[PDB]
């Protein structure tokens, strides 16, 4: 692989109207590809990351919603309001990332525009942008992955740390919280 | 239409690479010289010419995309060849890097002007020349992105 070097591309698969209809029916026949899915509700759009066969995203984006699938709506396998996590089984066709095991502190955040931005880990759930960006550049990226140099999942982007519309750091959900969530359940 | 950051270019005598960074399509002077670049509307003249840094640039052509410069300072580089091969390179200095696994010189041939990327896929520099020992490339000379930025500011 996912890194060395990390590169990403985005592809749009559904328009506004199609999204609404699919949201109501809960039946999505579109083919799936990739590690990260760009997802949307009626009020917002964000990201969902596949890790170890599970499609994870932020609770603040997905709430308790089901996910549209070829077989109709799919209920979440995991839910953790306190940790701001939700997980569904990874859609057929998707590819999963695997958790980081190298403990690196040099992270790379993948945006909804498929840009890769370097992030220096400063704590369990925070990292600073090497080069700050306007908050608009990060909008709709929550639920997206923070990868280590080897392209393995270190955490999921939760919220930016802004000051005057400028993102200087990011709060993220470390992979560890995913395990804790899966055991809770 | 899919866009590329890297162009495979050629003159009547040689073939090499060009990389788009910051709206500019850059390459090596030793390859392009003072030449213009072709376009559907005729020749386009160089925007920049830096013989000393062995650098030249034209406006980014159609079907291209600009690559972001590296700002992480990593020493783990990755050189992209004209064949789309990725060569891991360890940064040894401002404009120098050693291949993790040496390659026959032919493997790098025609790649000058191509990019050296960091772990984030950003531009650390442009491949300038292979450093060879009896037909084996063990290191590379490159133009740091900083030089590109400087050239523009000029």
């Amino acid at each position: 692989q996912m890194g060395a070097p990390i590169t990403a591309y985005a592809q749009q698969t559904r328009g506004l109207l199609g999204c609404i209809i699919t949201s109501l029916t809960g039946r999505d026949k579109n083919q799936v590809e990739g590690e990260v899915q760009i997802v949307s509700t009626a009020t917002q759009t964000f990201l969902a990351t596949c890790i170890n066969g599970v499609c994870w995203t932020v609770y603040h984006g997905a709430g308790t919603r089901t996910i549209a699938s070829p077989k109709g709506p799919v209920i979440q396998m995991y839910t953790n309001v306190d940790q701001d996590l939700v997980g569904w089984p990874a859609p057929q066709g998707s590819r999963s990332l695997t958790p980081c095991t190298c403990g690196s502190s040099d992270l790379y955040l993948v945006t909804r525009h498929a840009d890769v931005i370097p992030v220096r880990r400063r704590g369990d759930s925070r990292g600073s942008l090497l080069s700050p960006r306007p908050i608009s550049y990060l909008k709709g990226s929550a639920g997206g992955p923070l990868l280590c140099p080897a392209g393995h999942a270190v955490g999921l982007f939760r919220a930016a740390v802004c000051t005057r519309g400028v993102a200087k750091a990011v709060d993220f959900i470390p992979v560890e919280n995913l395990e804790t969530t899966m055991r809770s359940g | 239409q899919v866009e590329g950051e890297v162009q495979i270019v050629s003159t009547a005598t040689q073939t090499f690479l060009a990389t788009c960074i910051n709206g500019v399509c850059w390459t090596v002077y030793h390859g392009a010289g003072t030449r213009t670049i072709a376009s559907p509307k005729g020749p386009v003249i160089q925007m920049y010419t830096n013989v000393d840094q062995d650098l030249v640039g034209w406006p980014a052509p159609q079907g291209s995309r600009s690559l972001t410069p590296c700002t992480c300072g990593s020493s783990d580089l990755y050189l992209v060849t004209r064949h789309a091969d990725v060569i891991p390179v360890r940064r040894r200095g401002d404009s120098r890097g050693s291949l993790l696994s040496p390659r026959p010189i032919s493997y790098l041939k025609g790649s000058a002007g191509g990019p050296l990327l960091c772990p984030a896929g950003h531009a650390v520099g442009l491949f300038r020349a292979a450093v060879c020992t009896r037909g084996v490339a063990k290191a590379v000379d490159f133009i740091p992105v900083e030089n590109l930025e400087t050239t523009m500011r000029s």
Binding site: - | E3, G4, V6, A32, V80
Partner: peptide, 17 residues
Amino acid sequence: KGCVVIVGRIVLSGKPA
């Protein structure tokens, strides 16, 4: 003198058509 001509392109992310 002759122009430099573009004979091909490379996309770093591997994005397909």
